């Protein structure tokens, strides 16, 4: 079947959140980093890369603290420490 404007994405996946990256659920890494629209287009594609990617290497560190949940068509590139208290978070780690 013919199609146009096919976009590609790359994202490290543990393996058990593939069922949750789809709309209607949020995974361990799909709660704060990856997302899909309400009715995702295209198809789910995956293969095995644990043998070669793993050696560990924390370059692909997944975000865990942030302001809120994900909205469609957004990029989580802001690396700000979550402010869960009245005291400002400037000054590295705090309570």
């Amino acid at each position, epitope marked *: 079947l013919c199609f146009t404007n096919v976009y590609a994405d790359s994202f490290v996946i543990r393996g*058990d959140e593939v069922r949750q990256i789809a709309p209607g659920q*949020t995974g*361990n890494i799909a*709660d704060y980093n990856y997302k899909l629209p309400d009715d995702f287009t295209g198809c789910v594609i995956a293969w095995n890369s644990n043998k070669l990617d793993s050696k560990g290497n924390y370059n692909y560190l997944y975000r*865990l603290f942030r302001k*809120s*949940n994900l909205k469609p068509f957004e990029r989580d590139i802001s690396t700000e420490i979550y402010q*869960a208290g009245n005291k400002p978070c400037n000054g590295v780690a705090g309570f």
Partner: nanobody
Amino acid sequence: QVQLVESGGGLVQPGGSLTLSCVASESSLAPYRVAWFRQAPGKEREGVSCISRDAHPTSTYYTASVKGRFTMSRDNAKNTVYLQMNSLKPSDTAVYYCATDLGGYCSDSNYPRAWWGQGTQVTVSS
């Protein structure tokens, strides 16, 4: 703005059982993770157990001291979490607090720590 009320604590003999109640008000805890904390006097806060919004055992965490003896259970149908707390040791004597945040899933190293209740006293002795 969410308010948590811990209850169910009291005096118990070693090996006994108790059920702690963390009543939430002014909000729904259903889409947010809820964790239990306890502090003994002189000792800092430490986690006890955490349950995610999905309430699966894989998303439910227990600390090493409580694994296999405490039971974490939440009722998102009626907005409350319960720590089923059995086979008591004197080392479990502490003020038990329940905590929640806007996070939806617990991790073994991350518990919700935004909003706290007044806590309940659990004492395991004669």
